Amino acid sequence: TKDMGGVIELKIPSQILNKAAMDPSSPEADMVRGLMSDAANAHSGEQSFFMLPSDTKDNAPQYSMTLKGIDGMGKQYSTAQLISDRKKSILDRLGAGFINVQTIHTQFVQRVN
Amino acid sequence: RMSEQGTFALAKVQVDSERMKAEEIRWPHLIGTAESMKQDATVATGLDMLYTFVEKAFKDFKVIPGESEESKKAAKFIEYCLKNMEGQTLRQFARDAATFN
């Protein structure tokens, strides 16, 4: 559930964000409210695209849109095989470990009889 | 001649063997270390399968008599005694005896 790979991140100058918070009836407020709904609905389809201003103030740009990813290496322990070992560990005590694939199971039943 | 000239040295063979063991598996402790093992799901399973066939073997036991008429009468009495212990059966005895594993 928490593997947010490829999530959308948006960067906006704080002048617009701050103006909207203090002026609910200003043009900045309308555009901010539009972004909060448009970004939630941003799927992939027949008309998906992005258009951002290209202004620049420093070495970094004012507006940007990037898709995040894990900056490094992911998980290593492969929890899948951990569970399989423990399941065979449990069923072996009951003689029913063959489901993980005269027998052991038949001989085990004779003990109870 | 007809005279022993030595001893089995039971009292020495033990006392060397208790030193040459890690101290968690010497006599007065091994009783605890056995029951603190077993709760491993691979150790229990190995012992359980061993007892499964030991009980099976000593369930349908038989007494084999000799050739003379005296032996046949003795074999019948032996079978009666071994199958009429008050509150005990050979399967229970076999699964108690096999605890030396």
From TrEMBL, chain B:
* Top-level taxon: Viruses
Write down what this protein is called.
Answer: Portal protein
Question: Which species is this record about?
Answer: Pectobacterium phage phiTE
Indicate the span of the full protein covered. 27 to 127 of 507
